[PDB]
Design a protein around this nucleic acid. Structure first.
Lengths: 94, 68, 75, 88, 75, 94, 68
RNA sequence: UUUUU
């Protein structure tokens, strides 16, 4: 539940999801679930001239198994609290 | 009829040939069960490169067929 | 199990390998024990009696009545 | 509508199945399970390049290899109606 | 117990080798049992094919999904 | 799922083999299997004009789903998809 | 799985399905075949390409571990 | 046997 809880905290902030098909999609995180399925709103595909297929899509669901990275600005991430949460996560499941 | 796990169990101590879904093979004498094989020769069936190993734990996820 | 004993069937595996053989036994993991199995290469080679791992099957069909046909559909 | 309710409701009717290897199968779906494993009857199997064709009296397809299924519109219509009958 | 190795790298710099000829160097701030990770101040190296070129990118903060990860080591 | 937000609406699926199929989302489940009705595929190319293939009712296995986008009808109405060229979407490689 | 005791603490070969090999002293193994090695050397096309001082290898990539 | 490959 550690990274699902974290992603819940990045909701309403801007992320870029790079997929295992090498597309990267930028948008406002609106939802994330236990599988790390993710919903982005107001997406813009990074290399839109390569890929006009999504020229009419504003709200977008990305399946969790196809994410390579989700990368985001450090401004909305507290890395000590994240690290503490992690230490407490691996203590709990131990 | 025939029972698969009983068949490999028949093979403990015997020579077993295991062929993966990729075009790779191993042939050696079976030690136990992911499988542990003894004195196995691994065959790359495309490049033809063959190499032998004295004993190895071979991951089971990629094995296709077992042949006594 | 949604599923021939001692009748000949063909089976195809993930990764592309495709074999034929007469079904002589099975269990519920869909392990198969098939003999006089021969895999058709991508020409054939014959593997003798093989136990097939149920997790790798994609397709099992009976051989009796499977045939190559010309285009049966509309142009 | 759950995808498995539609698949279960298409038992006994025609179905087109395309597998990851690109082959497609046209036949009557007689049965399926909750893994999406299928057994079909009276099938035409078409190889990936549309090159070669086989007729199969019946066939079993393990669900983990399916890319997609095509189902008649009336099956979906029948199920929508049935779910709309079950509410009252 | 294998994971204890990466447990010792929390808040330290790691090298991550990924499927697809990609490599990351960053500060490990979190991970789980799949090796999902969040790396801070990360550099990505992509090798493009003897290699034809490599492309380096920097990420202020970067989550990496565990199923692409091949190995994790000190830098 | 976040997919409950797309129910009964025009949806655009990008599959793991790079295909684009549009349709009304009639249902989904926790592995992301989908029912689309009145669906069709779009084949965008660089060499040739966009192709549209009718597909009818389409059940998609979740293992093969990369993205599900909500199609904005006004924005999509604004686009002349016939004269659109673009690169092939890559396959997802796991 | 008495292979483990026989092998833990000695040099091992991990061949990944990708074909890259890693040799080093084996610290640890687990049920999914995740590995910890103590001074890993990496080999591509058979040539040494990198050496890592300790390595965690995710088991899904390991095709086999062979003894030294 | 579909989301930790």
């Amino acid at each position: 539940m550690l990274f699902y809880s974290f992603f819940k905290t990045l909701i309403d902030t801007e992320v870029t999801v790079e997929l295992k098909n090498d597309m990267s999609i930028r948008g406002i995180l609106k939802s994330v679930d236990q599988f790390l399925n993710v919903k982005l709103e107001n997406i813009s595909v990074v290399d839109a001239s390569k890929y006009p297929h999504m020229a009419a899509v504003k709200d977008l669901f990305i399946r969790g198994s196809v994410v390579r990275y989700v990368h985001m600005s450090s401004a909305y991430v507290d890395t000590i609290l994240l690290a503490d949460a992690c230490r407490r996560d691996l203590a709990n499941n131990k | 009829t025939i029972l698969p796990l009983e068949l490999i169990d028949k093979c403990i101590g015997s020579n077993l040939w295991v062929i993966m879904k990729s075009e790779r093979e191993f042939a050696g004498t079976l030690v136990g069960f992911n499988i542990v094989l003894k004195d196995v020769t691994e065959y790359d069936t495309v490049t033809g490169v063959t190499e032998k190993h004295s004993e190895m734990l071979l991951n089971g996820n990629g094995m296709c067929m077992l042949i006594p | 199990s949604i599923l021939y004993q001692d009748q000949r069937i063909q089976a195809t595996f993930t990764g592309g390998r495709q074999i034929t053989g007469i079904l002589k036994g099975f269990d519920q993991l869909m392990n198969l024990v098939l003999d006089d199995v021969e895999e058709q290469l991508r020409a054939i080679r014959k593997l003798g009696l093989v136990v097939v791992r149920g997790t790798t099957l994609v397709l099992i069909a009976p051989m009796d009545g499977s045939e190559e046909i010309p285009n049966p559909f509309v142009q | 509508m759950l995808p498995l309710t539609l698949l279960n409701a298409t038992q006994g009717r025609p179905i087109l199945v395309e597998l990851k290897n690109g082959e497609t199968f046209n036949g009557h779906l007689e049965n399926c399970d909750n893994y999406m494993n299928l057994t079909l009857r009276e099938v035409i199997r078409t190889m990936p390049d549309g090159d070669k064709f086989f007729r199969l009296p019946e066939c079993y397809i393990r669900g983990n290899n399916i890319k997609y299924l095509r189902i008649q519109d009336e099956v979906l219509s029948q199920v929508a109606k049935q779910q709309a009958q079950q509410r009252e | 117990e294998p994971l204890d190795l990466v447990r010792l790298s929390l808040d330290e710099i790691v090298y991550v080798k990924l499927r697809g000829d990609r490599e990351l160097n960053g500060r490990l701030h979190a991970y789980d049992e799949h090796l999902n990770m969040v790396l801070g101040d990360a550099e990505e190296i992509v090798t493009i094919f003897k290699a034809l070129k490599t492309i380096r990118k920097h990420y202020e903060m970067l989550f990496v999904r565990g199923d692409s990860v091949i190995l994790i080591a000190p830098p | 799922m976040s997919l409950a937000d797309f129910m009964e609406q025009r949806v655009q699926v990008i599959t793991n083999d790079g295909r684009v199929v549009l349709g009304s989302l009639k249902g989904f489940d926790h592995t992301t299997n989908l029912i689309l009705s009145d669906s069709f595929e779009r084949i965008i190319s660089m060499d040739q004009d966009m192709e549209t293939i009718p597909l009818g009712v389409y059940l998609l296995r979740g293992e093969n789903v990369a993205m599900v986008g909500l199609v904005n009808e006004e924005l999509d109405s604004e686009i002349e998809w016939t004269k659109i060229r673009g690169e092939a979407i890559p396959d997802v490689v796991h | 799985n008495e292979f483990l005791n026989k092998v833990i603490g000695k040099k091992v070969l991990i061949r990944l399905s990708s074909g890259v090999d890693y040799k080093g002293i084996l610290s640890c193994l687990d049920g999914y075949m995740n590995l910890a090695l103590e001074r890993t050397e990496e080999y591509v096309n058979g040539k040494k390409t990198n050496v890592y001082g300790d390595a965690f290898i995710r088991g899904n990539n390991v095709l086999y571990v062979s003894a030294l």
